[PDB]
Amino acid sequence: TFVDIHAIQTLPYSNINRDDLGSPKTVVYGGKERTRVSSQSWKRAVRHEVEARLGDKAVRTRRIISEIAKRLRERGWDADLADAGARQVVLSVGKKSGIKLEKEKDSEAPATSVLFYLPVPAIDELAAIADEHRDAVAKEAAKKTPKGILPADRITEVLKSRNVSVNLFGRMLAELPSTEVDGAVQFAHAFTVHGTTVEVDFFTAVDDIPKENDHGSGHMNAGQFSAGTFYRYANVNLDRLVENTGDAQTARTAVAEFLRAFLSTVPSGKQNATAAMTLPDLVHIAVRFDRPISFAPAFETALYGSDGYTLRACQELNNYAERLREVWPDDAIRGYATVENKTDLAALGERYDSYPALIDAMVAAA
């Protein structure tokens, strides 16, 4: 009921995910600093590739009122009635008077304080609900402090609609706890197997018109980059994903699609300057029934270096997988797929020739 996927993936001078000052994010793990890619970033890349491949897209937005306003404006509403009707949409729901709004900005509809996370056709249905009650909205638009006229139950039922991404990663809405969905995926922070010092690159953007006398750079700075073999891990709680989608067939497509997205996608951080696109060097899908187990302790002792870390990382993940299957006995259906053929890696289960064959075999096994 737990599908967990491990992956070793090298990235060359990427710097895919930056902190607030531009340096790549780091964990001091095992006593040694190791650059990391935050989980929310790779999770965002996964949800956008899943939505793009499975066709249905969900929208995490702070500006729901403005978007409902374009739909009501395309339905034939005047701009002022479209704005008042979308304000009625967010005003009619929640415990207090309405969903709290950020301070009003000139010429634009105010953003909600919290980020809504709902599929696109559900936003259009909210526009239809505000549309049927056009005269009541017109009457409340004339008052100084209009109240939430729209039915709350209908709107709350639209805000409860779940996308595949909502089913998979969950959502949170503090004013409407009825809409909160438990996530079915645990996404770990991808850290390096080996210790990495932050590499500094010094670049100078060149002025193009020649100066008459003093030729110098137009601007000069230094951006930090790093490279290494990241360890990646993720869980999928099949009981919750089946509980969220309801039917096991959509959960099956959601899981297979998630695993493929996990392998295929890259966060795209300064990719136009580094081209860090890469396939994972090794992938290991286990289908466990008792509990998920990350192999991150296997790489707590940082690798020394001077030699290619890929073979030693794959072999070390192998030894830790072997030692855990001996220490914690289980009937979990294992399986792996690797690029290197220098080792058999016996503990990672049955070997499969390709990543899609592995994903199809383990999803079919669950």
Binding site: L21, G22, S23, E33, T197, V198, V200, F202, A222
Partner: protein
């Protein structure tokens, strides 16, 4: 205590840059690299006698002597403040950009000892390029204590910078 050997190094070297070219040119070719690097083997004649006995202290001494000799000719030609006080002086007087130099200082304050050395020569030569004053002994002692301090010196650097910028702005009224 180390401040003593640091002041002896600052004096002799400060004289060395001006009087003898072959020595400073032997020093500047070792900016920003660990002393084991072969480009540094020519700098031992000048620096090795002055270091007591961790690599952190050696890296501090050797590196500050190298940055000291890599000053542009204009800078070399011409309470005890830190590099942060020198930063705030370069913001208020010489007119450096503020949002970027404060960002660069809070960028240095997170590195480890390995990273500070990587970042420091570009920043210090930037400061030195427009005649900003930097007391090298303090910077030496601080760079020696960066190795065993998680943030205990950097905090001093950041606090002094913000504080000196505020006082320099309030004195202009």
């Amino acid at each position: 205590y180390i401040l003593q050997h640091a002041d002896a190094l600052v004096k002799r070297v400060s004289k060395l840059i001006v009087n003898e070219p072959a020595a400073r040119a032997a020093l500047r070719r070792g900016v920003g690299l660990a002393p084991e690097d072969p480009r540094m083997l020519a700098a031992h004649r000048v620096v090795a006698p002055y270091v007591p006995v961790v690599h952190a202290v050696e890296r501090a001494f050797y590196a500050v002597a190298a940055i000291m000799a890599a000053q542009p000719r204009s800078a070399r030609d011409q309470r005890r403040p830190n590099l942060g006080v020198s930063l705030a002086q370069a913001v208020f007087d010489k007119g450096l950009n503020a949002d970027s130099t404060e960002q660069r200082l809070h960028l240095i304050a997170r590195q480890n000892l390995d990273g500070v050395h990587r970042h420091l020569p570009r920043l210090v030569l930037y400061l030195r390029s427009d005649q900003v004053h930097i007391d090298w002994g303090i910077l030496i002692r601080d760079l020696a204590r960066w190795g065993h301090t998680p943030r205990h010196v950097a905090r001093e650097w950041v606090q002094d910078y913000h504080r000196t910028l505020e006082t320099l702005t309030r004195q202009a009224e």
